């Protein structure tokens with residue numbers, strides 16, 4: 001009730017990770033969770049999406065099979081969801097049991113700080129030497145007229161039936177992944193975005209290639225399209241832009257970012273520093289401004305990814321409970337995959353970023369090609385790759401790929417980039433043939449040198 | 453006739469590569485080819501096999517689709533053959549045109565040395581300052597009774613119709629790849645192997661997992677099985693082990709190694725050292741014992757891979773024609789993929805090799821799991837992975853993976869291993885989630901420690 005070494009607020013990626021490691025160092029751990037263990041990722045994030053992603057991968061596969069002489073003949077969405085939910089349910093079940101197995105005290109409900117070192121959960125108060133905030137986020141629904149006519153990614157994973165005509169508002173990760181899933185399943189898919197290109201945070205080569213692939217797949221896009229309101233039309237719902245432009249959808253999905261769950265956490269009661277956008281500032285070691293209070297995962301405003309939350313959690317527990325006083329996560333060169341169809345992946349800096357952060361010091365290599373996966377198909381999606389290099393030695397500061405296999409391609413490259421790999425390091429590595437990844441180690445002439 | 457800077461013998465991976473780079477450095481280049489440009493890889497190796505591998509990936513995708521709610525569905529082999537060959541043709545055509553574009557003097561026919569710096573092709577003699585031998589290999593057909601009833605991998609890519617009941621003799625690369633192609637196309641396949649495990653050269657964990665995957669997909673295997681002869685039976689041909697065991701097959705495929713094309717090459721006449729197995733010894737810079745004569749690719753008896761022949765050739769051209777007098781290929785840690793279903797991949801040393809070369813100093817990490825690719829399927833193939841580490845610092849000396857995605861997974865890991873990555877280097881890099889590769893950077897407790 002006061003004798004806990006650790007209270008982890010939130011049983012998602014970060015909370016589970018720090019609770020787990022702490023418990024393994026023989027600490028007394030309390031874990032607070034208002035909903036289901038596993039958090040966003042297991043329930044409404046990474047896992048349901050990747051399961052649905054395989055279904056779309058397999059659907060593309062049955063379309064392309066006759067081209068290779070494989071005689072194949074459409075989605076049963078209820079069966080997909082049922083299978084997906086059984087699988088997700090099993091991971092929830094694992095975690096429920098694992099937490100009990102570790103000896104962690106689970107507390108159901110919504111935790112709020114009551115002071116610098118105590119929380120209250122449905123009237124019950126609990127103190128600890130260390131309180132870790134890992135409450136994650138939730139999808140943003142804009143304060144616009146008729147915004148409630150649209151659903152979010154949470155709503156997407158709740159859908160019991162496949163919608164026929166979809167509008168996706170936002171072209172970040174989830175907007176693009178949702179678009180690719182649904183079009184692959186044969187829905188009409190339009191995506192709209194504020195920006196002049198899809199996947200704005202990513203390198204212009206990936207953005208451009210993705211657009212081509214998406215256009216080729218029949219996905220309608222509208223760039224520089226600000227949604228002013230959503231309205232009800234004759235059997236369906238309509239998007240209304242700034243200028244008055246109208247768009248008959250049976251589903252409109254808001255994919256315009258996520259907000260941190262820090263609104264009534266009692267942070268002011270505890271004197272915890274928090275930004276106007278709800279992000280909780282931390283140092284490199286997840287320390288907030290209040291000693292004994294830490295934040296990790298999405299609410300910290302750094303790379304919004306599951307393995308980032310986990311790693312941040314494990315290292316924090318190592319720091320606090322294993323006397324590894326200098327232990328921290330490195331937030332440079334975190335690899336990521338966007339599960340489009342075909343998917344994309346990157347580690348490190350895009351060209352514009354590297355040009356921002358470093359000078360006119362960039363040597364940039366790139367290539368485009370149709371992979372052998374589509375050799376016997378009519379119009380396969382193009383693969384595109386860019387190596388961003390910096391300095392005379394050509395340190396590789398960015399690796400960017402879009403195309404078949406990209407989802408499994410960059411993990412090892414992330415290792416090399418973290419080790420400070422140069423172009424030479426890549427080039428002295430013998431290719432694997434035949435495949436796509438070999439293209440990253442056989443780039444010859446650069447497209448841009450310092451001066452461009 | 454004698455004013456050539458380079459004669460490349462063989463228009464395969466090594467010959468093309470050295471000729472191209474020499475030509476690019478403004479040298480006068482002759483390229484001798486007796487058959488088609490592109491060599492083995494383009495015509496009867498990597499490319500046809502990978503084309504068919506995709507058909508096989510798609511057939512499996514077709515099988516698995518209903519489990520994921522995708523309402524699907526059987527191979528039209530002629531359609532596959534026609535598509536494959538058309539794709540192959542384009543690459544040959546590219547090379548034909550490319551060699552002409554580079555200004556290389558192509559010469560059709562079989563080259564033999566006449567002296568240390570001269571070759572003869574169908575009567576014409578040609579000298580050069582530099583002669584690169586890159587004549588590659590050919591499948592081995594053993595000198596057993598009725599060996600000729602079987603076919604080779606060359607014969608596999610010549611087949612116009614899908615065989616119904618196939619025997620694969622050999623559990624190296626080719627045997628395994630072919631077995632997996634055929635089985636997913638619905639043929640009956642049994643593979644026999646001299647060794648006690650499939651893919652002997654590979655790490656036991658890969659071998660053991662591949663056996664499991666292959667058994668689960670209906671492939672029958674016979675280990676420690678030495679075929680003594682092939683005889684005709686009542687429709688089909690039979691395998692006879694030397695103990696007497698008998699196996700009725702539609703086609704029998706020898707996949708028992710490849711022999712170097714160096715028997716009728718005039719190496720005697722030029723004074724070039726050759727081993728009894730036909731391999732041509734070289735130093736680290738591809739130099740034979742006679743100055744001006746070099747060898748690369750398969751006949752050198754090093755890693756028998758396309759990109760290895762290519763890199764060796766390019767680097768040799770840089771050495772010879774661009775004053776980069778120290779340029780050579782590093783033969784340590786060549787990554788490779790074996791295109792089974794699902795494929796496997798490795799870079800560096802297996803556990804047995806590492807103990808053999810480095811001693812009782814290994815920290816070995818292992819994991820095994822069913823990837824999310826098979827989440828809604830009944831019995832997906834296993835994925836298995838091993839990190840082989842050496843020393844107290846735990847340098848990564850071996851990386852090994854079998855399973856979905858293995859074919860695109862290890863290229864970047866090869867770079868890291870090339871740089872001398874340790875386990876710490878792996879663990880300090882954040883995982884990509886969700887996927888399989890992340891398992892390689894999140895291996896916690898080792899299975900074996902020094903001792």
Ligand SMILES: Cc1cc2nc3c(=O)[nH]c(=O)nc-3n(C[C@H](O)[C@H](O)[C@H](O)COP(=O)(O)OP(=O)(O)OC[C@H]3O[C@@H](n4cnc5c(N)ncnc54)[C@H](O)[C@@H]3O)c2cc1C
Pocket residue numbers: 009010011012013014015032033034035036037038039040041044045046047049109110111112134135136137153174261265296297298299304305306307309884885886
């Ligand atoms: C659709 C979608 C797809 C995604 N795909 C990927 C992907 O493929 N790869 C990847 O790496 N990342 C992906 N992410 C991001 C990833 O899910 C998050 O980065 C990760 O879950 C963050 O973990 P966390 O611990 O910070 O927050 P969460 O995992 O969301 O955990 C927070 C938990 O705390 C609980 N909680 C909140 N407030 C309280 C309270 N005050 N008291 C008690 N409990 C509380 C919540 O119920 C929640 O369970 C995806 C996200 C979305 C939405």
Ligand SMILES: Cc1cc2nc3c(=O)[nH]c(=O)nc-3n(C[C@H](O)[C@H](O)[C@H](O)COP(=O)(O)OP(=O)(O)OC[C@H]3O[C@@H](n4cnc5c(N)ncnc54)[C@H](O)[C@@H]3O)c2cc1C
Pocket residue numbers: 432433434461462463464465466467484485486487488489490491492493496497498499501561562563564586587588589605626713717748749750751755756757758759761
């Ligand atoms: C079935 C199979 C699958 C394979 N799969 C892969 C794989 O996926 N990945 C990979 O990296 N490697 C693979 N390989 C191995 C790869 O093909 C070889 O390592 C590569 O082709 C070797 O190149 P090379 O230049 O040494 O020989 P080759 O490419 O075989 O070139 C030799 C050429 O020389 C010609 N020649 C021979 N004698 C003479 C003569 N005296 N005069 C003139 N010309 C002559 C031949 O016609 C031939 O064209 C595979 C091989 C096989 C057979």
Ligand SMILES: NC(=O)c1ccc[n+]([C@@H]2O[C@H](COP(=O)([O-])OP(=O)(O)OC[C@H]3O[C@@H](n4cnc5c(N)ncnc54)[C@H](O)[C@@H]3O)[C@@H](O)[C@H]2O)c1
Pocket residue numbers: 142169170171172173174175177192193194195200225226227228255256257258303304305336337338339885
């Ligand atoms: N595969 C993965 O690793 C994975 C998958 C999904 C999400 N994630 C994580 O979760 C986060 C989720 O971000 P997100 O994709 O929801 O959004 P985002 O922040 O990445 O993108 C913002 C988008 O909102 C749009 N937008 C905002 N207001 C608009 C308006 N009124 N009209 C039209 N468009 C408007 C903009 O056009 C913009 O494209 C990501 O940052 C990522 O880190 C990861």
Ligand SMILES: NC(=O)c1ccc[n+]([C@@H]2O[C@H](COP(=O)([O-])OP(=O)(O)OC[C@H]3O[C@@H](n4cnc5c(N)ncnc54)[C@H](O)[C@@H]3O)[C@@H](O)[C@H]2O)c1
Pocket residue numbers: 433594621622623624625626627629644645646647677678679680707708709710755756757788789790791
């Ligand atoms: N994916 C790729 O990178 C790829 C694919 C295929 C081949 N290759 C290359 O080509 C080379 C040749 O491959 P390979 O598989 O033909 O050779 P191999 O040396 O790997 O095959 C040896 C096999 O021959 C068998 N064998 C020999 N005599 C036998 C007997 N009488 N009875 C039963 N079994 C017998 C053994 O059991 C053994 O399994 C490889 O070294 C490889 O580098 C590469």
Ligand SMILES: [Cl-]
Pocket residue numbers: none
């Ligand atoms: Cl236990």
Ligand SMILES: [Cl-]
Pocket residue numbers: 110122
């Ligand atoms: Cl409440």
Ligand SMILES: [Cl-]
Pocket residue numbers: 260261262263264265
């Ligand atoms: Cl909240």
Ligand SMILES: [Cl-]
Pocket residue numbers: 056057060340341342343
């Ligand atoms: Cl896909």
Ligand SMILES: [Cl-]
Pocket residue numbers: none
């Ligand atoms: Cl030109």
Ligand SMILES: [Cl-]
Pocket residue numbers: 562574
């Ligand atoms: Cl002849």
Ligand SMILES: [Cl-]
Pocket residue numbers: 713714715716717
């Ligand atoms: Cl010969």
Ligand SMILES: [Cl-]
Pocket residue numbers: 508509512792793794795
């Ligand atoms: Cl496969």
Ligand code: NI
Pocket residue numbers: 001002003004127
């Ligand atoms: Ni207490």
Ligand code: NI
Pocket residue numbers: 117118127
């Ligand atoms: Ni107090």
Ligand code: NI
Pocket residue numbers: 453454455456579
């Ligand atoms: Ni001459």
Ligand code: NI
Pocket residue numbers: 567569570579
């Ligand atoms: Ni002479």
